[PDB]
Design a protein around this ligand. Structure first.
Ligand SMILES: NC(=O)c1ccc[n+]([C@@H]2O[C@H](COP(=O)([O-])OP(=O)(O)OC[C@H]3O[C@@H](n4cnc5c(N)ncnc54)[C@H](OP(=O)(O)O)[C@@H]3O)[C@@H](O)[C@H]2O)c1
Ligand SMILES: NC(=O)c1ccc[n+]([C@@H]2O[C@H](COP(=O)([O-])OP(=O)(O)OC[C@H]3O[C@@H](n4cnc5c(N)ncnc54)[C@H](OP(=O)(O)O)[C@@H]3O)[C@@H](O)[C@H]2O)c1
Ligand SMILES: N[C@@H](CCN[C@@H](Cc1cnc[nH]1)C(=O)O)C(=O)O
Ligand SMILES: O=C(O)CCC(=O)C(=O)O
Lengths: 425, 423
C-alpha cells in the first residue's frame, strides 16, 4: 500500500495532495520542509491545533476538505525509518538538491518516491542521486494535476484549488509498476484521470509547463514584465501588447514541441499531439473554434496550419468560453493572470519568481541532456539565450551586489551527464 | 467649378459635406429630402432660423462650423435647373430610385453627380437611369469619409462627426472634377486617392469585405434578430462575438470572389490585409509584420486566413490606446450589435447593419452572374441571411414585419448595370 507517507515540501501542492491522500487512507501522514519563515509559521499553526485545509473555488467547491498532519519536520535530523512513500511537492528545479539532502541512511524502508511535477530526465536524475542499492521505485507524474495556491501566507496551511486538469500521466522506474494504479485511485478522488504510461520519460514528455512556459515566458515580452519594478505587470496569457502571446511566440511553441518530440523518440517515448493535449487534457474550447478533426489531425497538419490552430486556441481562451455570460454578454476573463515580478528577499537581494526561473532551469537541463543524443535544439537554445540576455541586463542595471546568485549562470552539464549515464546503465 | 450644389438626402453625411463644401468655396447650397417626419422637422427648424451645424468631437473640433441652407425641397419635380453639382447623401440602396425620380430632362445644367458611398456597379447603375445625351459626370467615392450622426432628431440639422477616415478613393465616369473633390474632402483631413475608373474606387469599400462574412453569418443574425439576452459584440471572438476561423475563411473566399469580379470589370483589386491595416486600424509589427502585410496577396490560403484571424484578434483591444494602471488597453471590440426594433407603425425593422450589407451583396452576386462568376461564398452568406430573416418572419408574422424584410430581386438592376458597362 502507501504505508506511511512523507510529504517533502509543504506548500500548496502538498496540501491538495494531502487531502487526496487522507481520502484514500492507510497510514501516518508526515511532512518535511526546510527551515525558513514558512516552516516557522507551519510549526506555529500546527502547535495551536490547525489542520491542512483545502478549498475548491467555483465549480471545484466540491473538493473542499480538511486533512490532519501527524508530524511536521523542519529538521531532517529528527526523521527516522518510518516512511514507505515519499512525495516530492517541492519545485521541480529543486528535486536534485532535495533528494541529495534527505537522510537516506534513516530512510531504508522507503519503497516509492513520487515526483509530482516531473520534466524530461527528472526520474533518471533522481535515481542517479539515490544511494547505491536503494530499492525505492521513482514515479514521475507528468504535471501537477490542479491549480492551487496558498491564499494567505499568514495561514500557511490553507490552500485554494481553482482548476483541476482532466488528465495527467504517470510513469515508473519499475516496469509494469503496481504503484501507478494506487496513485490513479488517489488522484481520481479529485476528479483527475491518471493514465499510466510504460516509462517515466513518456509521462515526463507530457509536462504541460515545459511546452507552454518555455515559449511564452522566456521571451522578451515576459522577461520585460517580470524584471520590471514600475508599471503594470501585464498578463501571462493575453495577446501583445497586454501579454506575451504573438505569432512569433506560437511559432516558437510549435518548433520547441518538434524538438522535444524528437528527444522523446530518441529516449524511447512516444511524443504527444500538442493541440489535443492542450485542449483535451488541460482546457478545451468549442468546436467552432477548434474542430475535432483539426485537433485529432494536428500532428499531420503542416507547420502553417499548426501555428494557426495554436494561435486560435490561445485567442479562444482569452475568456473562458464555457463560463456563464454576464448581463452584457461577456465571459470570464480567463487570461488575466498577472505576471509575478522580481522582488527583494530578506537579505535585500533581488529574486526571480518561479515563472520563469523554474522554467529556465528545466529547459536548460533538457537541452544539456539532448546534446548527449546529438540533438542541438536550436529553438530551445534561442529561448534560453533570451532569458539569459534579459537577466544579464537586469544584473548590469541593478548591480551584481544586489542580486541573488540564482540569477547567475547555471551549469547543467553535470546533471545532464548523470542522467545520460543512468539511462545507459 | 462646383457651382450651386444640391445635397440629396439632408442627413448626417450631407451636413459634414456641406461644411467641407463651404470651406472650399461653392455657390448656393440647396437640399432635397423626401417627404417624411424628418423633412417636417427640417422645414420647421428652417422656418425658425436653423442653419446646418457641424460639431467635431474632441480632436476634430476644428471641423465645427455653421452653414446656411439657401433652398430646401422635398419634391424632386419642384427643382429648378439651377444646380451644377448633385451630391447623393442618401443610403446607397436608394441611389437608383433617387436618380429615376429626378426630372433630368429639365436639369441640363447638372455637370457632376457625386455618389458618397458607391458600391460595385453604382456608377454604372446611376448612368443607366440617365437620359441619353445627359451631360452629367458621375463620381464614385469608395465610402463616406467620416463617422457622423445627427445628435438629436429634435434639432435636425445639427450633426456630430466623431472620427475621420485616413483614406478614401474616388473614380469618375469620365476618363481622366476628381481633383476638385479631392481638395474639398481633404479639408476634413481625409486623403482622397483618385483612381482610373469608378469600379476601382467602388471595390475599395471596406464594409463589402468585412460586414458580409461577419454579419451575414449565423451568429450575427441570431443576435440581430433576438429581443432578449445580451446583444453580443460585433468584433469579438466566439462566443462573445461572431469571429471564428470559419468566418475568416468566408472573408478570404469572398475577397477572392470580389477580386475576380473587379478584374473582369477592369479594376485592380485590393490586398485585403494591407487595406485593413493601412486604411482602417493598424497593429504592431510583432502581430502583423510589414512583409506579411505587403505579401498577403501571394501568401497562400492558409497563411492568409491565419493573418486575417491575427489581425482581428490583435484588435480585440486597441493596441495603440494608452494602457490603464492594470496594463489593459481600450476594449475596441466591444461594439454591441444593434438589433431589430419596431418602427413607428409597430413593424419590425432591421438595422442598417446588416440590411444595407445584404442588399449590396445581393446586387453584386446578380451582377457577377453576367460575368459568368457564380460567387458560391457570397451566395452562402446571402442564403444564411435569407433563411434567418425568413424564420423571424415565420415566428413574428408577416403582418408584424416591415416589407424591407421580405424577399428582394436584384436581377433587373444587375442587368441594367451590365448593359451600361457593355455600352
Ligand atoms: N501550485 C500549482 O498550481 C502548480 C502548478 C504547476 C506546477 N506546479 C509545480 O509544483 C511545484 C510546487 O508548487 P507549490 O505551489 O506547492 O509551491 P510552494 O509555495 O512553493 O511550496 C513549495 C514547498 O516547497 C519548499 N521549497 C521551495 N523551494 C525549496 C527548495 N529549493 N528546497 C527545499 N524546499 C523548497 C517550500 O518552502 P519555502 O517557501 O520555505 O522554501 C514550500 O513549502 C511548483 O514549483 C511546480 O513545480 C505547481
Ligand atoms: N457616419 C455615417 O453617417 C455613415 C458612415 C458610413 C456609411 N454611411 C451610409 O450613408 C448613407 C447616408 O448616411 P446618413 O448617416 O447621413 O443617414 P441619415 O442621417 O438617416 O440621412 C439620410 C437622409 O436622406 C433622406 N433620404 C433617404 N432616402 C431618401 C430619398 N430616396 N430621397 C431623398 N432623401 C432621402 C433621409 O430622410 P428620411 O430619414 O425621412 O428617410 C435623411 O434625411 C447611409 O446609408 C449610411 O449607411 C453613413
Ligand atoms: N497553468 C498551466 C499551464 C497551461 N496554461 C494554460 C492556459 C491558461 C491557464 N490559465 C489561463 N490560461 C494552457 O496553456 O493551456 C499549468 O502548468 O498547469
Ligand atoms: O496557470 C497559471 O495561472 C500559471 C501557469 C502555470 O502553469 C503555473 O502556475 O506554473
Amino acid at each position: 500500500s502507501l504505508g506511511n507517507v512523507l510529504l517533502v515540501g509543504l506548500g500548496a501542492v502538498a496540501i491538495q495532495v494531502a487531502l487526496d491522500l487522507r481520502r484514500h487512507g492507510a497510514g501516518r501522514l508526515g511532512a518535511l520542509n526546510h527551515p525558513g519563515r514558512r516552516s516557522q509559521r507551519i510549526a506555529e499553526a500546527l502547535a495551536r491545533g490547525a489542520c491542512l485545509q483545502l478549498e475548491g473555488q467555483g465549480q471545484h467547491r466540491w473538493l473542499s476538505g480538511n486533512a490532519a498532519l501527524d508530524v511536521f519536520h523542519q529538521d531532517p535530523a529528527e526523521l527516522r525509518d518510518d516512511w514507505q512513500t515519499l512525495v516530492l511537492c517541492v519545485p521541480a528545479d529543486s528535486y536534485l538538491d532535495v533528494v541529495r539532502g534527505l537522510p537516506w541512511e534513516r530512510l531504508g524502508g522507503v519503497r516509492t518516491l513520487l515526483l509530482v511535477s516531473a520534466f524530461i530526465g527528472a526520474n533518471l536524475l533522481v535515481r542517479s542521486a539515490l544511494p547505491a542499492g536503494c530499492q525505492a521505485t521513482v514515479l514521475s507524474l507528468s504535471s501537477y494535476y490542479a491549480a492551487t495556491k496558498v491564499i494567505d501566507e499568514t495561514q500557511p496551511l490553507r490552500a485554494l484549488t481553482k482548476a483541476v486538469k482532466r488528465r495527467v500521466y504517470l510513469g515508473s522506474s519499475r516496469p509494469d509498476c503496481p504503484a501507478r494504479e494506487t496513485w490513479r485511485r488517489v488522484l481520481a478522488g479529485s476528479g483527475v484521470e491518471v493514465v499510466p504510461l510504460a516509462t517515466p520519460e513518456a509521462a515526463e514528455g507530457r509536462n504541460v509547463t515545459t511546452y507552454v512556459h518555455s515559449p511564452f515566458f522566456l521571451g522578451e515580452f515576459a522577461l520585460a514584465r517580470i524584471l520590471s519594478e514600475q508599471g503594470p505587470p501585464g498578463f501571462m496569457y493575453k495577446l501583445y501588447p497586454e501579454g506575451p502571446i504573438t505569432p512569433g511566440a506560437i511559432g516558437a511553441m510549435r518548433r520547441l514541441w518538434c524538438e522535444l518530440s524528437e528527444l522523446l523518440r530518441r529516449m524511447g517515448a512516444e511524443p504527444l499531439n500538442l493541440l489535443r493535449f492542450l485542449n483535451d487534457d488541460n482546457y478545451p474550447v468549442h468546436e467552432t473554434m477548434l474542430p475535432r478533426a483539426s485537433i485529432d489531425g494536428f500532428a499531420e497538419a503542416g507547420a502553417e496550419r499548426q501555428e494557426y490552430l495554436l494561435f486560435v486556441r490561445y485567442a479562444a481562451l482569452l475568456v473562458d468560453p464555457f463560463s456563464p455570460a454576464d448581463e452584457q454578454g461577456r465571459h470570464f476573463d480567463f487570461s488575466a493572470v498577472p505576471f509575478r515580478r522580481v522582488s527583494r528577499d530578506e537579505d535585500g537581494l533581488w529574486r526571480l519568481p518561479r515563472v520563469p526561473l523554474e522554467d529556465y532551469r528545466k529547459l536548460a537541463l533538457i537541452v544539456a541532456l539532448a546534446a548527449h543524443f546529438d540533438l542541438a535544439m536550436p529553438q530551445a537554445r534561442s529561448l534560453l539565450a533570451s532569458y539569459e540576455n534579459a537577466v544579464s541586463r537586469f544584473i548590469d542595471c541593478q548591480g551584481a551586489s544586489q542580486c541573488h546568485p540564482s540569477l547567475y549562470p547555471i551549469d547543467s552539464r553535470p546533471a545532464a551527464d548523470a542522467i545520460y549515464r543512468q539511462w545507459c546503465s
